[PDB]
């Protein structure tokens, strides 16, 4: 028990590693896909108005509206087409690291160091955005929050815990435990049944929402994982950490499939997002750039250099028209 | 421009004016981040200033101080310290009374002050250090000074030398010319503890003004 259980766990881990190695290689695997070479994305819009560091942004369903959270205590809902401030939501807490847009477009979510996921109702009467459902129950800070639907939300926190909440009652209905370190990122599957979760314990765990248990784990990194994102297929995901590398894992094979690293890159990755087709993988770094890797060729296809501080958040439209990055220079820009 | 689009532009301009006014009002505030240990290093200075994060707002001498209790965040400090890169100062407290108390109180992570002094964001952020429980130090020091705290003392007894020794030891970890460390002695009985941080904040803002005037 004191040592027999530990020996059994070590033997099980060794057997899992051996099975993973035996379930690898097979029919390096690149087929001369004729990569995109160099893509020259340019800044089409600039969005001024924030007076502190932009920590998170999220796109809307219509790919025309977006929400941005800054350290000055404000959410701003921008109309990206005409550079219009649709809404300016003040917040009780000025320390927010995440913000979300409900897919229905009726709500936004906001969270940070106050350990509360606040929902805000946009499409309501009285012409003002009001607070509704300050969900509470986490002990650590919230690093991410994603809407399942108008009634269900998922929140990843710094107390080594993810949570699934229903917003109608205000009570958490599922708790996801198993991470040893603080959880930093969260990406929902397209079918809204599963989600990946990266932690500072250099582990990413794939969870089933309905069952409530970790279906599998991946431990191929060496530092704190900061960002994660699903492939549009829902069968793979990619992530980045503070060891200046990105890794694409696959859900079914349960291995690390590809690694994006460079010798001259010695800065951590803050934000990771795919394009619509999944061929492009855009990652924001601490070197003030935003690199665009080829997700199937593992080379730096492009560089987005328009920010004078740390690129913190990075989002891509649902229709693939635009890429919006927010950095610590109080400005977020749109590339096309 | 349609009538609806012109009214939308007018609404956006009103929002921009409100944002500028709020930023103008908030640029006068002073952001101080409060750090230390649970042994009377946080609550006494919070009380003498008058869930996840606690705000302590006050206005001293037409200066809006707001103090940032993050003591409830029982987690790793590395993943949320970048939120405090823009603060004026770090009010860090070190317990004298725990020179012999095991927890040792002086050896928090062995680097409770080293990590704060050099966490790649506080490279020019001043630290106001507070020496905790001076009265109990004066009524307690007659019990094994040269102990597990610092076995290199070779010095005099009583409060006025041991306190100076520990203060110099904690200042010796600075290794920063631009950054300054302001130390003070507290007893949780006095009322002159807002001016210790206020004069410090005046010094940092005068230094920032000198740097902005192109003279240093």
């Amino acid at each position, epitope marked *: 028990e004191l040592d027999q259980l530990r020996q059994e766990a070590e033997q099980l881990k060794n057997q899992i590693r051996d099975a993973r190695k035996a379930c690898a290689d097979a029919t390096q695997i690149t087929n001369n896909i004729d990569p995109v070479g160099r893509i020259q994305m340019r800044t089409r819009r600039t969005l001024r108005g924030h007076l502190a560091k932009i920590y998170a942004m999220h796109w809307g369903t219509d790919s025309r509206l977006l929400v941005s959270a800054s350290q000055d205590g404000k959410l701003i809902i921008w109309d990206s087409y005409t550079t219009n401030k649709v809404h300016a939501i003040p917040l009780r807490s000025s320390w927010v690291m995440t913000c979300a847009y409900a897919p229905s477009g009726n709500y936004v979510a906001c969270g940070g160091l106050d350990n509360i996921c606040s929902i805000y109702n946009l499409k309501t009467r009285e012409g003002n955005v009001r607070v509704s459902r300050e969900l509470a129950g986490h002990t650590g800070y919230l690093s991410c929050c994603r809407f399942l639907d108008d009634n269900q939300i998922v929140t990843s926190s710094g107390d080594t815990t993810c949570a699934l909440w229903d917003i109608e009652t205000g009570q958490q209905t599922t708790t996801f435990t198993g991470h040893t370190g603080d959880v930093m990122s969260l990406s929902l599957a397209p079918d809204t049944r599963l989600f990946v979760s990266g932690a500072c314990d250099a582990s990413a765990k794939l969870w089933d929402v309905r069952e409530g248990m970790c279906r599998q784990t991946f431990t191929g990194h060496e530092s704190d994982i900061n960002a994660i994102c699903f492939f549009p297929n829902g069968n793979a995901f990619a992530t980045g950490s503070d060891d200046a590398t990105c890794r694409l894992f696959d859900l079914r094979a349960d291995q690390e499939l590809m690694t994006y690293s460079h010798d001259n890159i010695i800065c951590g990755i803050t934000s990771v997002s795919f394009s619509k087709s999944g061929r492009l993988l855009l990652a924001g770094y601490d070197d003030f750039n935003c690199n665009v890797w080829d997700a199937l060729k593992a080379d730096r296809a492009g560089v987005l250099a328009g920010h004078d501080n740390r690129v913190s958040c990075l989002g891509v439209t649902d229709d693939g028209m635009a890429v919006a990055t927010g950095s610590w220079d109080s400005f977020l820009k749109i590339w096309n | 421009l*349609s009538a609806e689009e012109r009214a939308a532009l007018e609404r956006s301009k009103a929002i921009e004016k409100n944002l500028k006014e709020d930023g103008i009002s908030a640029a006068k505030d002073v952001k101080l981040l409060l750090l230390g240990a649970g042994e009377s290093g946080k609550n006494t200075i919070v009380k003498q200033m008058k869930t996840g994060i606690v705000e302590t707002h006050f206005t001293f001498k037409n200066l809006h101080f707001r103090l940032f209790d993050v003591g409830a965040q029982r987690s790793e400090r590395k993943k949320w310290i970048h939120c405090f890169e823009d603060v004026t100062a770090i009010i860090f407290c070190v317990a004298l009374s725990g020179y012999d108390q095991v927890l040792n109180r002086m050896h928090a992570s062995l680097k409770l002050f080293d990590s704060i002094c050099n966490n790649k964001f506080f490279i020019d952020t001043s630290i106001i250090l507070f020496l905790n429980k001076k009265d109990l130090f004066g009524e307690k020091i007659k019990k094994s000074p040269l102990t597990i705290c610092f076995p290199e003392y070779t010095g005099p007894n009583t409060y006025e030398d041991a306190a100076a020794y520990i203060q110099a030891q904690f200042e010796s970890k600075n290794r920063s010319p631009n950054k300054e460390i302001y130390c003070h002695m507290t007893c949780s009985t006095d009322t002159n503890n807002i001016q210790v941080v206020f004069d410090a904040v005046t010094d940092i803002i005068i230094a920032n003004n000198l740097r902005g005037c192109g003279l240093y």
Partner: single-chain antibody
Amino acid sequence: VQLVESGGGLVQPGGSRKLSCSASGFAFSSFGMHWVRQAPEKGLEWVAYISSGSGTIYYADTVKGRFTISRDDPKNTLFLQMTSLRSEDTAMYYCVRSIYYYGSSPFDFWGQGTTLTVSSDIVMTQATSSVPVPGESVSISCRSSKSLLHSNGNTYLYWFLQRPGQSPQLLIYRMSNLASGVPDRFSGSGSGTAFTLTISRLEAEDVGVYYCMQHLEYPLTFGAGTKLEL
């Protein structure tokens, strides 16, 4: 939401009357306000428009220069002062809530109006005056003198309904986009200078007069009014 009208009554010609509107239940300071008149036996007609912040003010050409519109946001009260009252000023007046951003619903709420009795525009006309018509589907047409499709893909025709003894209500904003508290049986369609309103499975409490209003460019010109009766 409650917009309450006050003032009116019987006046002598050449006098002045100060109509007032008290707004409650909503953020009055972020809403544009409209004054819209209606003749005792004819269709609706727009009078005045004030925007949020008291910045942009538009008046009707038929009453421009003698009518003043104003507001007080601390008191939450809209005001319309009218001097040199004429015989055509005998009408009953409406205060209209409107809000303008992406996806907004202007002209959504209409107040309970007040009566006053004195002892490069665009033509907006409906070719049908009355249709006798439950359980069926009706289709009602509206025509304009200019194309209402602007270059951003937005058409600016709004469909309103006026019940016998009720303030007007918004059914559709911006060419087949429904509003809050409206059954899904109503629908819209059409193109430039030719719009259709479709009611499928017409239940009761749809008797009344329908109007089509344009918001492409000021002044605001209403239609004639398609009357549906059992």
